[PDB]
Ligand binder design. Sequence first.
Ligand SMILES: Nc1ncnc2c1ncn2[C@@H]1O[C@H](COP(=O)(O)OP(=O)(O)O)[C@@H](O)[C@H]1O
Ligand SMILES: [Mg+2]
Ligand SMILES: [Mg+2]
Length: 297
Amino acid sequence: GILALVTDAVSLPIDYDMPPLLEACRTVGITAEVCDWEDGTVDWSRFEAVVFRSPWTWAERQAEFLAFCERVSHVTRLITPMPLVRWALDKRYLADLAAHGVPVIPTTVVAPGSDALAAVRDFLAARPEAREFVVKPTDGCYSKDVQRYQRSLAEPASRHVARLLANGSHVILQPYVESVDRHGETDLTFFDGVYSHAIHKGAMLMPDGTVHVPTLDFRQARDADEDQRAVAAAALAASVAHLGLDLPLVCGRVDLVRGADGSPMVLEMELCEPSLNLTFSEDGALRFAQALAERLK
Ligand SMILES: Nc1ncnc2c1ncn2[C@@H]1O[C@H](COP(=O)(O)OP(=O)(O)O)[C@@H](O)[C@H]1O
Ligand SMILES: [Mg+2]
Ligand SMILES: [Mg+2]
């Protein structure tokens, strides 16, 4: 019952979770092997199951990674089955969350083939109150191609949008949530539908155009309040219901931001290959290994 933990050379160095996850696996008796999804020498048929941990370059070659996952599902069991994978790797899931009553950041999806500039202008027209907005691909991570713009910069942003559509990605337009500048965001980690821990992550989009990447210095242990955990758990339940999942998500991370209302709303959610912040909790890794141990029974 060897367990494959998927990563890739470029991403393994920033997967702070792998070291502690491997020890936890050791503690629950499961033999895990770290595998690069682009390593053609891997016989995926050898594994009992596979878990996608940090194949984070998928953001650079989405179709390629999705194809990889698809091919792997034929030779071995995926802890996160394909339906979940395709759905979790596209921020369009924010609309499904909204349909389930889960509070999310007002989100507008621009599909390939759309008029980039018109799309941006209609967006700003519908939200005359948004002083700034953000452009981002629905299929990305680690701040990839994410940018902040003052509403007067529609044309430049439309060019950013066009660049993304050209690569065949859907683009999401959202108003810039003002509280993020001073209160960043809160990322909650769950295991089998149960809250484990959270962290605070500083803002990534600087007013001066700088776009940061969530490195360790941008994170710190945080205790999510009732409301935040309540929203996070709703987002997860909505995901379980939407996909018809028989079991809770082995693990997941729900990122929340503060609205003007003060109440929390989902920024993004990671259910396929999330950074879990295991090293910021005293038993998060054990809870993850245990949840995995239950799936392998
Ligand atoms: N609508 C928004 N308002 C304010 N900040 C945001 C918004 N969208 C994105 N950001 C900032 O950009 C970062 C990355 O955006 P995100 O949605 O998390 O895509 P990614 O999957 O690459 O992390 C966030 O951590 C946040 O700091
Ligand atoms: Mg992400
Ligand atoms: Mg994020």
